């Protein structure tokens, strides 16, 4: 099975890239129930340049054609306990995303779920043995509430609701 992300407008198949990292935001309010919620970044472009792991491809939420890690998933942040500072995620192995050209970009559901657990595991090293939950974006302008990027001078917008809807014990 695959995950089909609705995109507007339709991106050609040659704009398919490799997902090399993510940028997240921890939900404010300490629940103290061993439950930490993470959403896509509610930050502007200053948060993306801080990670330095994004390539030359202009992109939000997800990083396309960026730099990978070595042998292990790495998580970095300016302050871990500041929910206002975004959380940079760098993958060890990339996740390929292939756009059909009819307004949809597909992603391996098995590969995405496997990398999602390894991100939840490395987050537990920073916050303790707690339950990791991924939720959709909290809102914003179309360029940040959606996974946006450019390809040869054309702007694209893809809904990433299906990528952040998992619970990991």
């Amino acid at each position, epitope marked *: 099975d695959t995950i089909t992300l609705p995109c507007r407008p339709a991106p050609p198949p040659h704009c398919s890239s490799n997902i090399t990292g993510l940028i997240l*935001t921890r*939900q*404010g*309010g*300490y*629940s103290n129930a061993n439950t930490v*919620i993470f*959403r896509p*970044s*509610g*930050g*502007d*472009w*200053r948060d993306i340049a801080r990670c330095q792991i994004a390539g030359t491809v202009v992109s939000t939420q997800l990083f396309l054609n960026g730099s990978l890690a070595e042998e292990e998933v790495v998580i970095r942040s300016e*302050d871990w*306990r*500041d*929910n*206002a*500072k975004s959380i940079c995620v760098q993958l060890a192995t990339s996740v390929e995303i292939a756009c059909t050209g009819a307004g949809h970009c597909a992603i391996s559901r098995a590969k995405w779920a496997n990398t999602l657990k390894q991100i939840a595991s490395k987050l537990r090293e920073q916050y303790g043995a707690k339950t990791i939950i991924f939720k959709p*974006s*909290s*809102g*914003g*302008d179309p*360029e*940040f*509430v959606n996974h946006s990027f450019n390809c040869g001078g054309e702007f694209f917008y893809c809904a990433s609701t299906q990528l952040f809807a998992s619970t990991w014990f």
Partner: antibody
């Protein structure tokens, strides 16, 4: 001169909605985060969430997730916070706060406060 | 959580919070019917426009705000803040 001016007092029927405004002046409105903190009559301060004026992103507290919506209007440098499903226990004063850091929690600039009472 | 002190007394308010690498701890002063004012950030560093009689020190999990000598303007309520969490207020009243 960085100043934040909020809307006047508001009286709302129970279960309705209230939209509070917070107009910014004296600085670049889209660079600094804007937070919202409520205060019950004799109780303490309670942080509700912040909004990113540049990207539009938000981060509400779990206690308010689903009951609060924060927006901003860049044409007038005003940040809006709407609270839905109002209850009698929501009678408090709502402050908008800006930090000294771009996205810091050290609030160095406050609005005058907006008294919001919910009564039938 | 009420403090009865006179003009010239020394006041040390202690705030129990979590330990921070950067000693993240802020103090606020609030008057009746007025918005809070930031007095100290990062446990020890003061704020411009705040008298030197205010000071703070934070080692580990104990953070304290100290007023070297109370003036008539200092009688108010004081809150400590760690990120989004605020603490209970400490009201300092005039003793007679």
């Amino acid at each position: 001169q960085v100043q934040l001016v909020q809307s006047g007092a508001e009286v709302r029927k129970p279960g309705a909605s209230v939209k509070v405004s917070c107009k910014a002046s004296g600085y670049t409105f889209t660079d600094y985060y804007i937070h919202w903190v409520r205060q019950a009559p004799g109780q303490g301060l309670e942080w509700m969430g912040w909004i990113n004026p540049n990207s539009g992103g938000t981060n509400y507290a779990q206690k308010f997730q689903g009951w609060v919506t924060m927006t901003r209007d860049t044409s007038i440098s005003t940040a809006h916070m709407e609270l839905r499903r109002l209850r009698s226990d929501d009678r408090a004063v709502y402050y908008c706060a800006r930090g000294v850091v771009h996205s810091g929690f050290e609030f160095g600039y406050w609005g005058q406060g907006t008294l919001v009472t919910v009564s039938s | 959580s009420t403090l009865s002190a006179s003009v010239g007394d020394r006041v040390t308010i202690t705030c129990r919070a979590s330990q921070s690498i950067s000693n993240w701890l802020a103090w606020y002063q609030q008057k009746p019917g007025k918005a809070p004012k930031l007095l100290i950030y990062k446990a020890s560093s003061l704020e411009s426009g705040v008298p030197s009689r205010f000071s703070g020190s934070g080692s580990g999990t104990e953070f304290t705000l100290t007023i070297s000598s109370l003036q008539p303007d200092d009688f108010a309520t004081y809150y400590c803040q760690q990120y989004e969490t605020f603490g209970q207020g400490t009201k300092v009243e005039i003793k007679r």
